[PDB]
Amino acid sequence: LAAALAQAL
Ligand SMILES: *C(=O)c1ccc(-c2ccc(C(=O)OCC)cn2)nc1
Ligand SMILES: *NNC(=O)c1ccc(-c2ccc(C(N)=O)cn2)nc1
Ligand SMILES: CCc1ccccc1
Ligand SMILES: CCc1ccccc1
Ligand SMILES: CCc1ccccc1
Ligand SMILES: CCc1ccccc1
C-alpha cells in the first residue's frame, strides 16, 4: 500500500 502511493514521488 505505501509503495502504491510512494510511486508519485
Ligand atoms: C503497497 O503498496 C505494498 C505493500 C507491500 C508490497 C510488497 C511487495 C513485495 C514484497 C516482497 O517481495 O516480499 C518478500 C518477502 C512484500 N511486500 N508491495 C506493495
Ligand atoms: N516517486 N518515485 C520516483 O520518482 C522514482 C523512484 C525510484 C526510481 C527507480 C528507478 C530505477 C531503479 C533501479 N533501476 O533500480 C530504482 N528506482 N525511479 C523513480
Ligand atoms: C487497496 C489499496 C492497496 C494498494 C496496494 C496494496 C494494498 C492495498
Ligand atoms: C506494489 C506494486 C503494485 C501496485 C499495484 C498493483 C500491483 C502491484
Ligand atoms: C500522481 C498519480 C498517482 C495517483 C494515485 C496514487 C499514486 C500516484
Ligand atoms: C514504487 C513501487 C511500485 C512498483 C510498481 C507499481 C507501483 C509502485
CB of 7 sitting under 6 A from ligand 6: yes
Q: Supply the Cα-derived Rg of the chain in whole angstroms.
A: 5
What is the Å distance from ligand 4's center to 6 Cα? Answer: 11
Q: How far apart are CA 2 and CA 9, in angstroms?
A: 11
Q: How far apart are CA 1 and CA 6, in angstroms?
A: 9
Q: How far apart are CA 1 and CA 9, in angstroms?
A: 14
Residue with cell 514521488: 9
Q: Which residues have any ligand 2 atom within 6 Å of their CB? A: 7-9
- Identify how the structure was determined: X-ray
Residue with cell 502504491: 4
Backbone angles phi, psi at 7, to 5 degrees: -55, -30
Q: Which residues have any ligand 5 atom within 6 Å of their CB? A: 5, 7-8
Listed resolution, Å: 0.8
Q: How far apart are CA 3 and CA 7, in angstroms?
A: 6
Q: How far apart are CA 7 and CA 1, in angstroms?
A: 10
Q: What share of the chain is helix, strand, coil (3-state, %, to 5)?
A: 55, 0, 45
> Which grid coordinates are listed for 8?
508519485
